[PDB]
Amino acid sequence: AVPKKKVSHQKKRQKLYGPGKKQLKMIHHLNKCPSCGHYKRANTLCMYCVGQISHIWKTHTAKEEIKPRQEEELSELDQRVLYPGRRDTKYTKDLKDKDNYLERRVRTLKKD
Amino acid sequence: TVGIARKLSRDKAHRDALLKNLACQLFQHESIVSTHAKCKEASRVAERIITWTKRAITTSNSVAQAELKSQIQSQLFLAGDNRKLMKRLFSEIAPRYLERPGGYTRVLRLEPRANDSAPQSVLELVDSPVMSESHTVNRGNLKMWLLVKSVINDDANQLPHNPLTLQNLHKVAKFKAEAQLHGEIMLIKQVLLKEMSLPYDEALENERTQALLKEVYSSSSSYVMVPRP
RNA sequence: AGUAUGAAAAUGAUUAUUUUAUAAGCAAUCAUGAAUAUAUUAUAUUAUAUUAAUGAUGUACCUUUUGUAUAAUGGGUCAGC
RNA sequence: UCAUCUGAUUAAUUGUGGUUAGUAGUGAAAGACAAAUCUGGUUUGCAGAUAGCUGGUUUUCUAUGAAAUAUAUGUAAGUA
RNA sequence: AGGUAAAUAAUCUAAAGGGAAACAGCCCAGAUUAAGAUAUAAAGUUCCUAAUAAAUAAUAAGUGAAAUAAAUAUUAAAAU
RNA sequence: UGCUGACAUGAGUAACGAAAAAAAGGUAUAAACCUUUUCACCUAAAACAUAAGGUUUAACUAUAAAAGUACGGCCCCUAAUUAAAUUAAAUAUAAAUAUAUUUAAGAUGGGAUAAUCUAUAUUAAUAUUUAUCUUAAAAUAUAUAAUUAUAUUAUAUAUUAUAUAUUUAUAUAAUAUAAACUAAUAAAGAUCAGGAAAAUUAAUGUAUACCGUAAUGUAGACCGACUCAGGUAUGUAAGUAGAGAAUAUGAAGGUGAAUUAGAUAAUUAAAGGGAAGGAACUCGGCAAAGAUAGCUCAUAAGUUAGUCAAUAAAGAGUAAUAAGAACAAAGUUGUACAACUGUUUACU
RNA sequence: AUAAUUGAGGUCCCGCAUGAAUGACGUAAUGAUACAACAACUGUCUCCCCUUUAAGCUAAGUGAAAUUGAAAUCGUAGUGA
RNA sequence: AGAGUAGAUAUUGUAAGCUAUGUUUGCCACCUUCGACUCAACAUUUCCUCUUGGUUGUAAAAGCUAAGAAGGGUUUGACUGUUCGUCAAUUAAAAUGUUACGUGAGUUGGGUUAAAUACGAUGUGAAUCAGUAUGGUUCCUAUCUGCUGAAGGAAAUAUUAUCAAAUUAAAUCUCAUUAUUAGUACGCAAGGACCAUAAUGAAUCAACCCAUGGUGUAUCUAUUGAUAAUAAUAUAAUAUAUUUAUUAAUAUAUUAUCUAUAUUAGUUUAUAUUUUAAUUAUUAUCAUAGUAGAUAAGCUAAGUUGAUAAUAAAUAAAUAUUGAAUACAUAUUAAAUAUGAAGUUGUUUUAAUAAGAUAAUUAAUCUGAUAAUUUUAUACUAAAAUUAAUAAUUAUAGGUUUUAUAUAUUAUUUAUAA
Ligand SMILES: [Mg+2]
Ligand SMILES: [Mg+2]
Ligand SMILES: [Mg+2]
Ligand SMILES: [Mg+2]
Ligand SMILES: [Mg+2]
Ligand SMILES: [Mg+2]
Ligand SMILES: [Mg+2]
Ligand SMILES: [Mg+2]
Ligand SMILES: [Mg+2]
Ligand SMILES: [Mg+2]
Ligand SMILES: [Mg+2]
Ligand SMILES: [Mg+2]
Ligand SMILES: [Mg+2]
Ligand SMILES: [Mg+2]
Ligand SMILES: [Mg+2]
Ligand SMILES: [Mg+2]
Ligand SMILES: [Mg+2]
Ligand SMILES: [Mg+2]
Ligand SMILES: [Mg+2]
Ligand SMILES: [Mg+2]
Ligand SMILES: [Mg+2]
Ligand SMILES: [Mg+2]
Ligand SMILES: [Mg+2]
Ligand SMILES: [Mg+2]
Ligand SMILES: [Mg+2]
Ligand SMILES: [Mg+2]
Ligand SMILES: [Mg+2]
Ligand SMILES: [Mg+2]
Ligand SMILES: [Mg+2]
Ligand SMILES: [Mg+2]
Ligand SMILES: [Mg+2]
Ligand SMILES: [Mg+2]
Ligand SMILES: [Mg+2]
Ligand SMILES: [Mg+2]
Ligand SMILES: [Mg+2]
Ligand SMILES: [Mg+2]
Ligand SMILES: [Mg+2]
Ligand SMILES: [Mg+2]
Ligand SMILES: [Mg+2]
Ligand SMILES: [Mg+2]
Ligand SMILES: [Mg+2]
Ligand SMILES: [Mg+2]
Ligand SMILES: [Mg+2]
Ligand SMILES: [Mg+2]
Ligand SMILES: [Mg+2]
Ligand SMILES: [Mg+2]
Ligand SMILES: [Mg+2]
Ligand SMILES: [Mg+2]
Ligand SMILES: [Mg+2]
Ligand SMILES: [Mg+2]
Ligand SMILES: [Mg+2]
Ligand SMILES: [Mg+2]
Ligand SMILES: [Mg+2]
Ligand SMILES: [Mg+2]
Ligand SMILES: [Mg+2]
Ligand SMILES: [Mg+2]
Ligand SMILES: [Mg+2]
Ligand SMILES: [Mg+2]
Ligand SMILES: [Mg+2]
Ligand SMILES: [Mg+2]
Ligand SMILES: [Mg+2]
Ligand SMILES: [Mg+2]
Ligand SMILES: [Mg+2]
Ligand SMILES: [Mg+2]
Ligand SMILES: [Mg+2]
Ligand SMILES: [Mg+2]
Ligand SMILES: [Mg+2]
Ligand SMILES: [Mg+2]
Ligand SMILES: [Mg+2]
Ligand SMILES: [Mg+2]
Ligand SMILES: [Mg+2]
Ligand SMILES: [Mg+2]
Ligand SMILES: [Mg+2]
Ligand SMILES: [Mg+2]
Ligand SMILES: [Mg+2]
Ligand SMILES: [Mg+2]
Ligand SMILES: [Mg+2]
Ligand SMILES: [Mg+2]
Ligand SMILES: [Mg+2]
Ligand SMILES: [Mg+2]
Ligand SMILES: [Mg+2]
Ligand SMILES: [Mg+2]
Ligand SMILES: [Mg+2]
Ligand SMILES: [Mg+2]
Ligand SMILES: [Zn+2]
């Protein structure tokens, strides 16, 4: 149930790193994407090219934003009177800074 | 009960409902991204549904047709955005696949998602129309788009097309009128080139497309095999 | 819980040298090859240093006891007190 | 916690506030409870209580080097 | 009884070293520090393991060869 | 088992706390945030109103809006109770203090008026607990004033038509569902016999103070060291069903979560089914299994006479005959001990 | 009573060491009390099998604990606090 | 000594004698949990099975006693907490121990056990007991050793792909009944064989799923309650087209089936009024998979199939031959020569290892791995299958097609037509 001794430096290290099962393997199965000449996984789509195509689809197949007439044709002063500004909470501010906590996809290296 | 399908870490009732939802979403949006295992199971359902629809369309037996219809109805959630999904299935989706013997979907593997390391895939409908009757482009048929992008890249590099690319193009063609296919390719080029910011001289592009079509369409050792002494 | 400074140790990762995949026990000491490093008197057949070839000897430390390798006490390690 | 079980118009359950406790209350009485546990709480002080008992008591070198017997002891873990 | 109670001697206790396979108390012998030629102690001298050659008898059972198991039985052997 | 600090070991191991998720898009930044659609879960709640509490957690700093009427506090009044207060000498007392009496405080309670809206100031003058039956009345049908059977029976409002003050008032007549529920009324059964305390006319007034108000509240926003399956007061709690607040469903509302994706060995947990047998298991039938109406009938021995036994066991009617939601309902007996309903070691 | 009973009930009385409000005795009712029997039922068992979900296993992210003189931590026999 | 009809030594064996054991009850004081379940390992002082000596007390058959022998096997129930014991029913037999009286970081907790309580006894009493009874508390994610499986690395008498012997590590090894020989041998009769073979079983082990049974959150049908869809039809509105003389008629698309007021306070329902405010087909969700009847694959035992591994060799106790030493005798603790066991060696089976063997040898396609689709396999791994698309041949998974199975209605039918 309980360790009888302080496990030594040797014995913890040979346990962890000695076996190949536990080690990380080289990703030999990279290959060139045909659409953009960059690294991608074998039997896998290029995340750049499919992302680009998804973006294209979004730009074309776009549901139009609903802008109400009455709010679109308000005067500036009138709009200010109706819908004044406010102090956002700390939480709200944190939520707004998305680049702090949201990871954009990185581009791979160009294949040789 | 064991081995017939993926369990997907869900109770039976939930699992089936999930699969139905996935099928509905595939029919609505002609491609969808999801986890690999879910996509694989969803394909099985969607394909089955398509075949049933085809059978209903074709069969002379009235009772059979009615039964097929009932089965199709059972296998979908018809509400909200999928109210007129049955109609779409009969009129829009299933008529694409009348000549095609199975294989109506394609699950294309993606790079696994970063937060979760979950293997990610794209379940999508085969031979989805890239251009509707309105002057727009349609959401779906990712593989075709990718192929055309690869072709464009090859043209830019002034390289020959890869054998695999040619094979894929041939596969795409098999259930496609040649002129229609060409027109689709041309349409894809217009969007793709602009996105990538390469110049679109139209006549030259058309000629290239034609050349690509021609080679696709017109079909043309270490050990020796010797009889026993 | 001042301010500077900090190659103090425990501790982690990495590199170098050296030994190690037929060998068994306080992991040290003594014998003794080999390999490496440094050496403005290595003149060399040289000197020091580092390193579990191989051989021999070797039952942690304290406390408490007639008596403890004891499977009796107490201590995870180092730093300060 | 889940299942199962018992009471469920009564010696019922329960909200809000009040009274009674550290030789000391409350107790359909089990030494039961009195702020995560009482044959009598907690805190502060006497206070460095007391301990014939346990453990600990830190550099080096040099010289000599025991005893575990007798007697006594409310003494046989001690002390002369 | 590795028991208990005292008597005498020794060792251990507080004693390292050699021997007794390993060993608090047995057999030798008392470490001031080295050196390693010579005498050695107890104990050993086929190899493991430092060191050996003989003589005369007996055993044939591996008896025995560093921890001796009895009455009795059988088979011999001497002497009368 | 020294104290403090730092850093190891177990170990990148267990675990990440009852849980249903999917896609598309915000965004070629999202398992976790927002939106839309689909799916599910809670639904006499995981909803909607509130009380208490609390690092304001909120839909936020440009912030929770009150003269009063199905608005609370504050205020007036007092209960339980409290008070270095109160009375040459209230009484007692080593001091502290304690007692009695006064006065003051003290909500958990009582408190005028109100949509045809309402006016609170000042001055002057003399209600334990339970029940709404039976009878009787008239109404509706059958038969031949009287019988039989059935509901109805105190209050709650609009309409129409009359009669009196003069379209505004008062009274009368007639018209008009069922089932729950409310308040207010009346009469009244039982013993356990049911709070306290604070006037009326007239004249003159009344420019209406302060505080509470967010959200959370069967909970991530309180008490539990934690965003803890624990603890936490009250009122509404769509319909369909039913005796019902049981049980099923779920209109609406709210929610789907600081872990995910896969795989589903052994093994564990929590479930479902099981041939032939049926307690052979085991300390022990522990556990599991077992319900042939839940309504209406019927129901024994014994017995303290209490359908106590009884919700008796069996059994019948209605329903169903191959079965086909949940929930209520789980035998009979002998003996020991204790009359019984209760109480007890909060945590063996 | 059971194929078979140290249990149960009935009965006997060398009551080691019963007995009358530390109440004695026999009942009806009650009891989540204790023991025993019958019925019914069954995965309790003969004798386990299949299935379901949550873990377990793998990948990603986060990240405990008791313990620990130091460890280069085998079997047997012998020895020996 | 003495029993044993006679004779101490077939069998029995007083009291006294000499040992072994460490299985009981003690003693010592170095040293501070009984039973059940589960799985067992070891011993032999052998209970059964195999071999054999003796047995006026071996005629036969049952026995009794002794030697070899640990290969295989050695029980299920009633009572009790019990081990034990009593009994019942079996068995070839129901052996005796050791293993911290094996086994609680494997289960249990009935006994023993503290707090509550009562009884009998003891005590003035608090309370007590080699008493009785009811109730009643420990948990642990495994670091090392070890064991069960599974990988990676490795040094290979030097490579890879395959086939692989000796060997090592384990497994296995049986037993009963009936039948025949034979109612023979033997015996007055009653009774009744050895030697040996066969067939049925047994207990154990292994594999398997064709069939049978179970399961089957694949599936299908039935079915109660509530809710929610799609389609069709009707009505209404809006939008888009066509006709007609913005209106009406038609076609397509989308949305809608609400609402409000009455019946004396509130809620619900009902009807009436108001409004365009619909009733058939087919689905889904929830209620343990809602319940029930079937049920494919797989997995399984209740099922099916096979095995209990020979022949051979050397032996144990025991039984002999010739034959001295020792004129006889003596199977030899002499030389020679023979028999002899469920034991030993082996044999058989599994796992490991890889001596050896065939082949290829820097590669337009050498051998492996990474990758994908997977299952013959599986925790992860590993293993195995496939990764075809060109001059030919090769289907891994899904999908498709197919026949087949399941479900449950169906000739009162389906399809072609005249
Ligand atoms: Mg369900
Ligand atoms: Mg299905
Ligand atoms: Mg080596
Ligand atoms: Mg080692
Ligand atoms: Mg040790
Ligand atoms: Mg120690
Ligand atoms: Mg320690
Ligand atoms: Mg009751
Ligand atoms: Mg009453
Ligand atoms: Mg007591
Ligand atoms: Mg406390
Ligand atoms: Mg207490
Ligand atoms: Mg003092
Ligand atoms: Mg002190
Ligand atoms: Mg001296
Ligand atoms: Mg002395
Ligand atoms: Mg003394
Ligand atoms: Mg003393
Ligand atoms: Mg002694
Ligand atoms: Mg001493
Ligand atoms: Mg010495
Ligand atoms: Mg001395
Ligand atoms: Mg000296
Ligand atoms: Mg010998
Ligand atoms: Mg010896
Ligand atoms: Mg210290
Ligand atoms: Mg671990
Ligand atoms: Mg683990
Ligand atoms: Mg885990
Ligand atoms: Mg997104
Ligand atoms: Mg309910
Ligand atoms: Mg709320
Ligand atoms: Mg007052
Ligand atoms: Mg109040
Ligand atoms: Mg509030
Ligand atoms: Mg509010
Ligand atoms: Mg708090
Ligand atoms: Mg806590
Ligand atoms: Mg909570
Ligand atoms: Mg309801
Ligand atoms: Mg809803
Ligand atoms: Mg809420
Ligand atoms: Mg959670
Ligand atoms: Mg069964
Ligand atoms: Mg059956
Ligand atoms: Mg039993
Ligand atoms: Mg039970
Ligand atoms: Mg009667
Ligand atoms: Mg019930
Ligand atoms: Mg009682
Ligand atoms: Mg308790
Ligand atoms: Mg009896
Ligand atoms: Mg019994
Ligand atoms: Mg008395
Ligand atoms: Mg009494
Ligand atoms: Mg009671
Ligand atoms: Mg992880
Ligand atoms: Mg020693
Ligand atoms: Mg005689
Ligand atoms: Mg004798
Ligand atoms: Mg005989
Ligand atoms: Mg023997
Ligand atoms: Mg053998
Ligand atoms: Mg029994
Ligand atoms: Mg034991
Ligand atoms: Mg153990
Ligand atoms: Mg242990
Ligand atoms: Mg109990
Ligand atoms: Mg054999
Ligand atoms: Mg089968
Ligand atoms: Mg089959
Ligand atoms: Mg069958
Ligand atoms: Mg089957
Ligand atoms: Mg009303
Ligand atoms: Mg309508
Ligand atoms: Mg629900
Ligand atoms: Mg068989
Ligand atoms: Mg002769
Ligand atoms: Mg002879
Ligand atoms: Mg043999
Ligand atoms: Mg290929
Ligand atoms: Mg295949
Ligand atoms: Mg082919
Ligand atoms: Mg296929
Ligand atoms: Zn690319």
Chain A residues with CB inside 8 Å of B136's CB? 60-61
B168 CB contact with strand F at below 7 Å: no
| Residue B107 near residue B39 (C-beta atoms within 8 A) | yes
Contact A56 B191 (CB under 8 A): yes
- At a CB cut-off of 8 Å and minimum separation 6, what does B149 contact? A35, A36, A49, A52, A53, B192, B196
Residue whose entry in the numeric block shows the structure tokens 């005067």 = A75
Chain A residues with CB inside 8 Å of B192's CB? 56
Q: Please state whether beta strands B120-125 and A30-32 pair in parallel, antiparallel, or not at all (unpaired).
A: unpaired
Token output for A23: 């080690």
| Residue B36 near residue B117 (C-beta atoms within 8 A) | no
Chain B residues with CB inside 8 Å of A36's CB? 149, 153
Measure the CA–CA gap between B135 and A5, rounded to whole angstroms: 76
Token output for B130: 């890239």
Residue whose entry in the numeric block shows the structure tokens 């399908």 = B5
Measure the CA–CA gap between B195 and B29, rounded to whole angstroms: 22
Measure the CA–CA gap between B222 and B97, rounded to whole angstroms: 43
B134, burial (CB in 10 Å: exposed 0-12, middle 13-18, buried 19+): exposed
Residue B134 sits at the chain A interface (C-beta within 8 Å): no
Give the 3-state secondary structure of residue B123: strand
| Residue B146 near residue B163 (C-beta atoms within 8 A) | no
Task: Find which of A30, A50, A103 to mutate to test the B interface (most B CBs within 10 Å of its CB).
Answer: A50
Token output for B113: 């998602």
Token output for B209: 């497309």
| Residue B137 near residue B52 (C-beta atoms within 8 A) | no
Measure the CA–CA gap between A88 and A95, rounded to whole angstroms: 10
Contact B110 A103 (CB under 8 A): no
Q: How was this structure determined?
A: cryo-EM
Resolution (Å) of this entry? 3.2
The alpha-helical segments, DSSP class H, found in chain A are 9-17, 47-60, 69-72, 76-82, 90-96
- At a CB cut-off of 8 Å and minimum separation 6, what does B89 contact? B27, B49, B50, B53, B72, B76
Q: What's the Å distance between residue B57 CA and nucleotide H251 C1'?
A: 25
- At a CB cut-off of 8 Å and minimum separation 6, what does B105 contact? B26, B43, B46, B47, B123, B124, B125, B126
CA angle, B7 as apex, B3 and B11 as ends, to 5°?
130
- At a CB cut-off of 8 Å and minimum separation 6, what does A16 contact? A22
Token output for B6: 């993926």
Find how far residue B197's CA is from the centre of its chain.
27
Residue whose entry in the numeric block shows the structure tokens 């970063």 = B114
| Residue B213 near residue B181 (C-beta atoms within 8 A) | yes
